[PDB]
UniProtKB/Swiss-Prot annotation, chain B:
Function field: Catalyzes the ATP dependent decarboxylation of (R)-5-diphosphomevalonate to form isopentenyl diphosphate (IPP). Functions in the mevalonate (MVA) pathway leading to isopentenyl diphosphate (IPP), a key precursor for the biosynthesis of isoprenoids and sterol synthesis.
One term of GO molecular function: Hsp70 protein binding
Principal EC category: lyase
Listed NCBIfam families: mevDPdecarb (TIGR01240)
Lineage, opening ranks: Eukaryota, Metazoa, Chordata, Craniata, Vertebrata
Effect caused by changing residue 200 to W: In POROK7; uncertain significance
Record's protein name: Diphosphomevalonate decarboxylase
Tissues with expression: Expressed in heart, skeletal muscle, lung, liver, brain, pancreas, kidney and placenta.
InterPro entries named in the record: GHMP_kinase_C_sf, Mev_decarb, Mev_diP_decarb, MVD-like_N, Mvd1_C, Ribosomal_Su5_D2-typ_SF, Ribsml_uS5_D2-typ_fold_subgr
Pfam families recorded: MDD_C (PF18376), MVD-like_N (PF22700)
Length: 374, 368
């Protein structure tokens, strides 16, 4: 009998950047993230076991990756090592474009750990299982606001994930992913964070005497639902992450011209309202992740539309949660003070805080057919 | 009736952030290289108007307000060292640190007009922080100082211009737009909001000053180059760690950066270095024997158009035809017009006194 689950992606507000152990995958600092809603973004994963299967084979979007990959190996190990009816088959897919944003690896391994976890009846906490596949994958194991504890034990056993606050905790929070125009071939995050660790004297200071306090401060902002404090912290930590990339040698560059016009749009927007109503955060690419409350989504989206008009359609420019087009104040439009960049923004994914991985209950949803694919 | 010229300089260990706004005192020391006045220079003529209504000043032919706070502070400071002066200035700096070159020249000229003993570090610093590093030639240091009265926050020569004859400097003037944030306001903002800047000044800069000095001393280019690049990068990192964040590097800046690393990688050695100030313009450091090839690399990366008739300025140099291997290694598609032009210079001497009677920027009045 096949089993199928779905998993979410998550956006780090206190960024994870740099490993202290590349083998067990342990971070030099802890991280705090927000789980996005599977209604909008998700990874579907189907697993089936045995009958003396034609080995262990895993499918992703179509291409039949290899089980030899050191990452899958480590993952397949943890689950099987935790199993205290042999061969396994897995097929997974997702609904987020490879252009969309990042955090696709985490989601994928989170769903992998969850699906297989229950293909063996593993009731245990499988953070370690997902972590070995993808560091930040453990944060996608719970819904709402999740932290990835760097861990203190060299055996990488306490470097797990824990919920800071459930989905229902902040019903008003909203998340926007602004997929920007970009050609620049980006350096990978695994390869790049390694170079930052080997060469960035500022990265060492960030982890030793900066993050710990920010983690605590951020957990506090979430419990109290203090947006301005949440927003500020998020921007300063996004900025510091990219700062350490610039301090790496050779320097790394993920933000492009569009990234900056957006950064500047957010600060001008906030200054006009004389209040921190919007926040931005960037991962290892130029796409912008925007955090804002439900009551300010429409006006802010109307603002990006003004700054980066798609060039007639409106269709597919807004995806996910429904946003009603709002008009722009003349004073607000002036405060933005920025000539438009047509096409600057490909499209906008609108979502909210979501739950942890889900278990499906429809046979028609299984990804693996009565044997293979589809 | 005195005319002088002063040079600009490029900091290799960046000065960024003050510990005292009024006295212009840094939170860390800095080291720069004095570029030759044969390529870039500010000319300043001061005349003690034995009797004219107030003090007047002209910059490139346009009269400015002698009431600017920095100008006055500079005036009071030197006028202290010892009357009723008229000043005129000009420079061949197309619209970098033209400000430091300006006060170093004003302080040096007036110093001669009033016949002030010596050491204009403080007079210059009060006009523009980095100006004090333009009072000496070669490789100069701006010691941050231990005294709160800031009398020991001055310039100190690390080596004369004759020390590294081979070193060359290129200034790639890039096409840019975004109204840049001024450096005074920018760095003040950094000191108030950037936690990485504090760590930079407390535990990084000090040691880097020592190694930079050691690289110059031993003419160890590759080490001098890497450190220069790492510090340019850390400066811009603390700018981004500022809240709101500050951005000086643009797309062309990054292409040039990538170009440099690729060039070095192809040759299996650090032969070129870049450093960026509060703007997207790139300052390149490289030895004399590799400028021709690097110039050709830039030309190929950013073709000037009109066969670059006015693409190369300063020290004459002909690009070296690029090999097919080098082009493939740089792996960069063309960016026509990316670089408006390249200025070629080298290490130069401190400010100079112009003995030619025909050089005065103003006769017995204040006009051409």
């Amino acid at each position: 009998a096949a089993v199928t689950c779905t998993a979410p992606v998550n956006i780090a507000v206190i960024k994870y950047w740099g490993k202290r152990d590349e083998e067990l995958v342990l971070p030099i600092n802890s991280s705090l993230s927000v789980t996005l809603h599977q209604d909008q973004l998700k990874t579907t994963t189907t697993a089936v076991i045995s009958k003396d299967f034609t080995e262990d084979r895993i499918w992703l979007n179509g291409r039949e990756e290899d089980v030899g990959q050191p990452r899958l190996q480590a993952c397949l190990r943890e689950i099987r090592c935790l199993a205290r009816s042999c061969k396994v088959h897995v097929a997974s897919v997702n609904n987020f474009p490879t252009a969309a944003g990042l955090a696709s690896s985490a989601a994928g391994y989170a769903c992998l750990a969850y699906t297989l976890a229950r293909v063996y009846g593993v009731e245990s906490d499988l953070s370690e299982v997902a972590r070995r596949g993808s560091g930040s994958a453990c944060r996608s194991l719970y819904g709402g606001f999740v932290e990835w504890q760097m861990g203190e034990q060299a055996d990488g056993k306490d470097s797990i994930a824990r919920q800071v606050a459930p989905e229902s905790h902040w019903p008003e929070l909203r998340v926007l992913i602004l997929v920007v125009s970009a050609e620049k071939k980006l350096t990978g995050s695994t390869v790049g964070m390694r170079a930052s660790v080997e060469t960035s004297p500022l990265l060492r200071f960030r982890a030793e005497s900066v993050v710990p306090a920010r983690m605590a401060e951020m957990a506090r902002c979430i419990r109290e639902r203090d947006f301005p404090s949440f927003a500020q912290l998020t921007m300063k930590d996004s900025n510091q992450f990219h700062a350490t990339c610039l301090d790496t040698f050779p320097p790394i560059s993920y933000l492009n011209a569009i990234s900056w016009r957006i950064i500047h749009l957010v600060h001008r927007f906030n200054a006009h309202h004389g209040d921190t109503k919007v926040a931005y955060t960037f991962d290892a690419g130029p796409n912008a992740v925007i955090f804002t409350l439900d009551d300010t989504v429409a006006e802010f989206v109307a603002a990006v539309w003004h700054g980066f008009p798609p060039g007639s359609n409106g269709d597919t420019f807004l995806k996910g949660l429904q946003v009603r087009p709002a008009p722009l104040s003349a004073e607000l439009q002036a405060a933005l003070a920025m000539e438009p960049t047509p096409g600057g923004v490909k499209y906008i994914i609108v979502t909210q805080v979501g739950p942890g991985p889900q278990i499906l209950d429809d046979p028609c949803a299984h990804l693996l057919g009565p044997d293979g694919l589809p």
